[PDB]
Amino acid sequence: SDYTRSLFTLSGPATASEVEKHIQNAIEFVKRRDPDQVQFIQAFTEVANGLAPVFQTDLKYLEIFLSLSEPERVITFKVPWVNDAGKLMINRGFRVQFNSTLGPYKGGLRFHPSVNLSILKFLGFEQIFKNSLTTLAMGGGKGGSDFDPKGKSDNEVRSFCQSFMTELQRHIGPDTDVPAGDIGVGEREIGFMYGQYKRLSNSSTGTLTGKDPKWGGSFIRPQATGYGLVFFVQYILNDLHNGDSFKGKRVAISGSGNVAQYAADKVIDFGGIPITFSDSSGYIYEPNGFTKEMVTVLMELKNIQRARVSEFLKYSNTAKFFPNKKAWDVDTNVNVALPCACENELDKADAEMLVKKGCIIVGEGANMPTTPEAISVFKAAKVTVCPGKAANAGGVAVSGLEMSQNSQREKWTSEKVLEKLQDIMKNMSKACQEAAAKYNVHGDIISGANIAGFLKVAHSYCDQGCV
Amino acid sequence: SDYTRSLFTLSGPATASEVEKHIQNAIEFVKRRDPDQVQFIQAFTEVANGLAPVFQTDLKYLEIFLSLSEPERVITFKVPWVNDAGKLMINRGFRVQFNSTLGPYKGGLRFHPSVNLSILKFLGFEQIFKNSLTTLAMGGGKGGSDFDPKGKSDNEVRSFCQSFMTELQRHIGPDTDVPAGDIGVGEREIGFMYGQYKRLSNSSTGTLTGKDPKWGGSFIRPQATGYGLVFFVQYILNDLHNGDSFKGKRVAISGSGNVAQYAADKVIDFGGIPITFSDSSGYIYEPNGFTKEMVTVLMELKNIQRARVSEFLKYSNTAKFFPNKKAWDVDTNVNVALPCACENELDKADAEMLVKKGCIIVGEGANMPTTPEAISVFKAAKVTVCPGKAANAGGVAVSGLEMSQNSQREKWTSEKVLEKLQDIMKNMSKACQEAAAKYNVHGDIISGANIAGFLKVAHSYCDQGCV
Amino acid sequence: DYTRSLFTLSGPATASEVEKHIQNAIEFVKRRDPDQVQFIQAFTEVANGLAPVFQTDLKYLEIFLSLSEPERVITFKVPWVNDAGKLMINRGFRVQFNSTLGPYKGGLRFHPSVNLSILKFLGFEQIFKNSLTTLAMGGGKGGSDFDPKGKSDNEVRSFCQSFMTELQRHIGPDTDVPAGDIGVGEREIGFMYGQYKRLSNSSTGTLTGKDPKWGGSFIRPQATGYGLVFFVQYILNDLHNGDSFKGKRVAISGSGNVAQYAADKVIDFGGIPITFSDSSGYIYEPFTKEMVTVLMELKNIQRARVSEFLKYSNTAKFFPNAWDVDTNVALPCACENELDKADAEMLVKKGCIIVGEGANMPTTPEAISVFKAAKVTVCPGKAANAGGVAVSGLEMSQNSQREKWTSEKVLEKLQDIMKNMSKACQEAAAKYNVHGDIISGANIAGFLKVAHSYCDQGCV
Ligand SMILES: NC(=O)c1ccc[n+]([C@@H]2O[C@H](COP(=O)([O-])OP(=O)(O)OC[C@H]3O[C@@H](n4cnc5c(N)ncnc54)[C@H](OP(=O)(O)O)[C@@H]3O)[C@@H](O)[C@H]2O)c1
Ligand SMILES: NC(=O)c1ccc[n+]([C@@H]2O[C@H](COP(=O)([O-])OP(=O)(O)OC[C@H]3O[C@@H](n4cnc5c(N)ncnc54)[C@H](OP(=O)(O)O)[C@@H]3O)[C@@H](O)[C@H]2O)c1
Numbered sequence A, B: 001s002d003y004t005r006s007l008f009t010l011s012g013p014a015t016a017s018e019v020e021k022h023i024q025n026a027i028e029f030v031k032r033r034d035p036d037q038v039q040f041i042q043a044f045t046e047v048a049n050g051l052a053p054v055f056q057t058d059l060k061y062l063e064i065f066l067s068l069s070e071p072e073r074v075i076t077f078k079v080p081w082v083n084d085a086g087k088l089m090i091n092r093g094f095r096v097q098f099n100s101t102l103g104p105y106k107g108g109l110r111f112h113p114s115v116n117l118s119i120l121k122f123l124g125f126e127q128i129f130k131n132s133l134t135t136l137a138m139g140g141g142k143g144g145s146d147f148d149p150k151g152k153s154d155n156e157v158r159s160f161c162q163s164f165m166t167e168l169q170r171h172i173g174p175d176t177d178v179p180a181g182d183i184g185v186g187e188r189e190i191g192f193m194y195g196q197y198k199r200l201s202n203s204s205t206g207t208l209t210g211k212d213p214k215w216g217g218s219f220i221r222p223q224a225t226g227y228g229l230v231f232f233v234q235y236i237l238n239d240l241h242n243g244d245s246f247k248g249k250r251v252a253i254s255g256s257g258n259v260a261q262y263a264a265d266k267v268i269d270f271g272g273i274p275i276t277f278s279d280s281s282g283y284i285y286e287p288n289g290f291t292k293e294m295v296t297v298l299m300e301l302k303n304i305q306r307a308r309v310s311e312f313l314k315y316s317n318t319a320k321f322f323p324n325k326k327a328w329d330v331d332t333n334v335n336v337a338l339p340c341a342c343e344n345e346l347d348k349a350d351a352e353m354l355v356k357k358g359c360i361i362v363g364e365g366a367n368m369p370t371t372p373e374a375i376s377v378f379k380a381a382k383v384t385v386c387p388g389k390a391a392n393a394g395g396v397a398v399s400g401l402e403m404s405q406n407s408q409r410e411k412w413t414s415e416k417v418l419e420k421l422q423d424i425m426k427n428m429s430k431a432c433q434e435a436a437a438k439y440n441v442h443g444d445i446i447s448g449a450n451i452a453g454f455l456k457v458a459h460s461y462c463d464q465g466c467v
Numbered sequence C: 001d002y003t004r005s006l007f008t009l010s011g012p013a014t015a016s017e018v019e020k021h022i023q024n025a026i027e028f029v030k031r032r033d034p035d036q037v038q039f040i041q042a043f044t045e046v047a048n049g050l051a052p053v054f055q056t057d058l059k060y061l062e063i064f065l066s067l068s069e070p071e072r073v074i075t076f077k078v079p080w081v082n083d084a085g086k087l088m089i090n091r092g093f094r095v096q097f098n099s100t101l102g103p104y105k106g107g108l109r110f111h112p113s114v115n116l117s118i119l120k121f122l123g124f125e126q127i128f129k130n131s132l133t134t135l136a137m138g139g140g141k142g143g144s145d146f147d148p149k150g151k152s153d154n155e156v157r158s159f160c161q162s163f164m165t166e167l168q169r170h171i172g173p174d175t176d177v178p179a180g181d182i183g184v185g186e187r188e189i190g191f192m193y194g195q196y197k198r199l200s201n202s203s204t205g206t207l208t209g210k211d212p213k214w215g216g217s218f219i220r221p222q223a224t225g226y227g228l229v230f231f232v233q234y235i236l237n238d239l240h241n242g243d244s245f246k247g248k249r250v251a252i253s254g255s256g257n258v259a260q261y262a263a264d265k266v267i268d269f270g271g272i273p274i275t276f277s278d279s280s281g282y283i284y285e286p287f288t289k290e291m292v293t294v295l296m297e298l299k300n301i302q303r304a305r306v307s308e309f310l311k312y313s314n315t316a317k318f319f320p321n322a323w324d325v326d327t328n329v330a331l332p333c334a335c336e337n338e339l340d341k342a343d344a345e346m347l348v349k350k351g352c353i354i355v356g357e358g359a360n361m362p363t364t365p366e367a368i369s370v371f372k373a374a375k376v377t378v379c380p381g382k383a384a385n386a387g388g389v390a391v392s393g394l395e396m397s398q399n400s401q402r403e404k405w406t407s408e409k410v411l412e413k414l415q416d417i418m419k420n421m422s423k424a425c426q427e428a429a430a431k432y433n434v435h436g437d438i439i440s441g442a443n444i445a446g447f448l449k450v451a452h453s454y455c456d457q458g459c460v
């Protein structure tokens, strides 16, 4: 029942070495088209290599992957605005509308002086497949500006947000493109942009996500990524570790932001014991673990005071702080590791420590926390690694549930949103295992997440005539 | 109260003979407007004759009926496309937007060399009143082209589908007109047309039904018509036969396609015993019935092997095959007959056999299976006949549920779709019973389906000012 | 100035200070687009030509910098199926740079070399060339890396239709009117117009370069050559005290459409075209209208060399491997950098008083210094070869009026555009204290009309 077979030049099975040669030809082609987009080339390389098992079954999938690598539409535009000194400023705005096969373009907006086309293309490309994994009808996109919010008054941010949306509104809509927040775009910016969009469009629709619950926002948004991480690991523990669970397990958490805080809260609900938190200055350790009340104290320190983790020692006599050390160094048995801080935070040496300390599963809350060599250590040790692209998708999944609520003109209760998120992570975990088994890398959830995300997009793309 | 009375020339009660004359005047008027639309004239005649009891209460309903017989909008358009040899081809495309009183125009697309305006008008006119019966907010329409898919490559169908949708997209939309599949338009064509519509409109909406579950499709689509038939008959048995049920009932099913297969499955869920299946070559018979396992084997033979019913004897020692005979000929008591093969399959002699064999109810899975002379035999014998326009509407009902899921941006589970389909058939059966009791006679479900479908449109038409 | 308070830089500056500020502007442009080599060079060259304006008020350098950011750039995937039935994906672009003076206007280029940096450089320069025409046209440029060579007519048709299926969403008669360029001629304009009309369900002037049977204009082939002669003639009257082409021996380089029709209009003005050229060599006849027709037919149908025509004229002489022929007005109409320092000294010694550029940048910088010292006026190409874009604007006017003009009416309007363009260049040169420098005057006039209008409109 393949109606698009004739369109593709490459076809049929291939050996592993043949597939790498074809992947190299694809990477070179991407290089020639965009010679200096370093981040985008690297993202294409990583995703392609993660799909090698699929390409071995049929090389047509590599051709589909290459055709998806070209964005459907990119809009770059001048943004004029007047600052509080009365001077004209000009910034660059972007919206990369990468793929809409499974639904409207979906993806955050980043306001940061480092923003450029290469960065937004790399984030938008990966966003296609993370959004695919949520099982929701969402395509992939990303946008933003080189506008730097730092040092700017509230009114200057309002002026820029209004000018930025004056152009962007022409290209977005509730069934077309639904942007969201990112670095530099939080509740303040989403509100300013929503007001401008509503005024110009003369409509109240779900054209942005991350909105305040008072006007179209959703519950569980702050907790989504941390909770979704724990839901995913809990389901992987049951399915792959023969009925195991978080109950009674000591959990080493890195990071102390929203992902780490709310992952800790859900671990406690499941009976686990979170023992560590961390930041760039060091890590704190509670030998008998953190309680919900203790996590609340930490949340106030990080979210209100924006303090270092060492400050928690003022509130707990049992807590110990270790400067310039990672959470993985803690001297105690650790049964579960949840890196929720930043990319490359868990390296080869960290993985070797955790294996000896008794770690059975790793759950990635941050993006690409585990180094390639650390993943090799865990694979050899038979320690399951839950990939971030599936496990940390709770935030975008709730963004889709926000679109659903706006489409339904109904605000769900917090309990209903939480049930929907857990069920999404349940279905996502099953899809990863099934994809891994079908392609003969059983138990490789990292491969299963790459395969499941890509294949739904690829098959639908051919269903739709490859346009 | 009555706010439109002054608008109508015909009014008031009328005798049966007066109504017969007025129907003739209406038919002649329809002929003069479209002298050579043979199928449309016949469709207008058959629906009109089924509504005589309503016209006897108030002739204004005949004037409303005549006004509904003129489509709100018909669009015909040239469709240029280039075949695989590089030669320009021109086909004719159509969209008959017949009525939108109860909701957006809803109806399938047919690609077949026989397609013309008269055929699409007859299907679109009748579709108004079946879609009304689903209780859902759907109008009536039909479209397609004289394009002949036979002998065409996948690429040639893709080329035609894109050019066809290039024009059609201008006249349809999620709140305006939602086409679907039909003969010559299956998933391949729905996929190709959806991709083109998405590209031109720059939107992801439920503007087509019959979509794949990966991008906006619904569960229960294969099972919808067979399940809905059994749901409808079950409710008629409870309401009209004083708590009767499918439990313990021997069910003679004709046909061996999708309707027959899934009707048997739902019969088993309700405790009935399906004893027969049939095709053009003959019928097979199981004295003690078919199990779900036996139906599964039959489904594989028909859907994959494309075999005849006789092949099933290879898998069952209890099965018996009778060549060149109808399922109604089976020598055993039959309590329920479900004709699911084709029009006019159950004639006067077959009905006389079925009454003597103990048949208490007939449920039409196919279109017009029961001949007029067979219906008279059933009426005298007090055998309930469930009209097909209500009993086989499960497919269109699920298409409405697909629109609901797209509007809500939420994919329902199989179980939720099935419950909603069952509730639709419950309210449809109650409405048919109530209309028959109020206007013609208790237990005449055929009259009740004609009346209930028409009156919801007619009263809504007057509510809306007859525009 | 209602916008004075908006600008950080203000007030007069010395020549060295302007050089410092221009360098700061260039560095800012590089960091934003580090690898857009052609665009950086384009920003640099245009900025240096405006240094006299910047010295009067640094506000203009800040305006120039804000103009260097496109209003809108759209890049899009173009899927199409070739004659073998295989899916092909190409990249399409539309750089909508500036709309201050009117709808975005600029050609479409289909060539494998096409990329964002090139289209930005052409689109930026197009803003100021279109401003010089005096017509209400902004600046833009677009195209695709699609390569027409080796493609069948049907493959070009399929690509053009898919390309326009996306492009139609962003263009329109009052919004953006694309045109042809390398790789986009009558064939492609026709295919794209058909797709646009079908999707938009309208017949409007959203493309220029259209066939006269459906919205096209006369004088389209002849515009650039005719406009060059008009511009030089008006400069001769204005700056050389009533001088004219009549009786003047005209050394013309090249043998394309520009050189041919420039020769035809030179003859109409009473001048004597003495030279033509090709890459293999140049011919010199101590030519008539009949001879030019033969030369055009021989070159345009046979695709022959100029030497082949020398067999057809006994008076013609061919020199293998145009300024070198010696005899008692120079019009370079062949290619860039064709006129070097030594050639300028040759021509000055031969007595040439005016140079008219039909090609892009024919005269080297060192040659311009030689002509400047000799007081030989050089008419910049960006004004003199703008006749094609001017007639494209006249095509928009005819479409807006739903009236097809006679050939005579189109030609009169093209001539009047060049009369007003030459005056605007001269007056700008006088106001900024470089009298007779038509090159600077063309740079100044094109920029100032956009910049002042940009401030009038609130700098949005
Ligand atoms: N929706 C989401 O939130 C979401 C979803 C998927 C992935 N992610 C990824 O998750 C990470 C951030 O999660 P978040 O939202 O909780 O962000 P956040 O609020 O910035 O928290 C990040 C935490 O990591 C810490 N950190 C950074 N570098 C570190 C290092 N080298 N060693 C130890 N701690 C370090 C930070 O401490 P300092 O304050 O000292 O830097 C902070 O406590 C990023 O990688 C992000 O891309 C987030
Ligand atoms: N499924 C739906 O969406 C839907 C909805 C409403 C109404 N219907 C109607 O229901 C009927 C069947 O639908 P389906 O989906 O089951 O189609 P199908 O898959 O073609 O099955 C039709 C069955 O009837 C048999 N048949 C045809 N002519 C016959 C004859 N003269 N005597 C005995 N058997 C005969 C066919 O056997 P052969 O292979 O020998 O022909 C086949 O097994 C048609 O009237 C259709 O229009 C279907």
Ligand SMILES: NC(=O)c1ccc[n+]([C@@H]2O[C@H](COP(=O)([O-])OP(=O)(O)OC[C@H]3O[C@@H](n4cnc5c(N)ncnc54)[C@H](OP(=O)(O)O)[C@@H]3O)[C@@H](O)[C@H]2O)c1
Binding pocket: C224, C253, C254, C255, C256, C257, C258, C259, C277, C278, C279, C280, C333, C334, C335, C336, C338, C358, C359, C360, C385, C386, C388
């Ligand atoms: N035509 C327009 O609409 C237009 C408008 C504005 C500006 N221009 C500019 O004008 C220039 C030429 O335009 P065109 O219409 O004449 O193009 P064309 O019709 O292709 O003719 C160009 C001619 O120049 C010749 N040539 C190339 N390099 C040469 C060299 N080094 N010495 C002598 N001759 C050389 C070529 O001779 P061969 O036959 O041996 O190749 C060719 O015949 C280009 O720079 C173009 O951008 C054109």
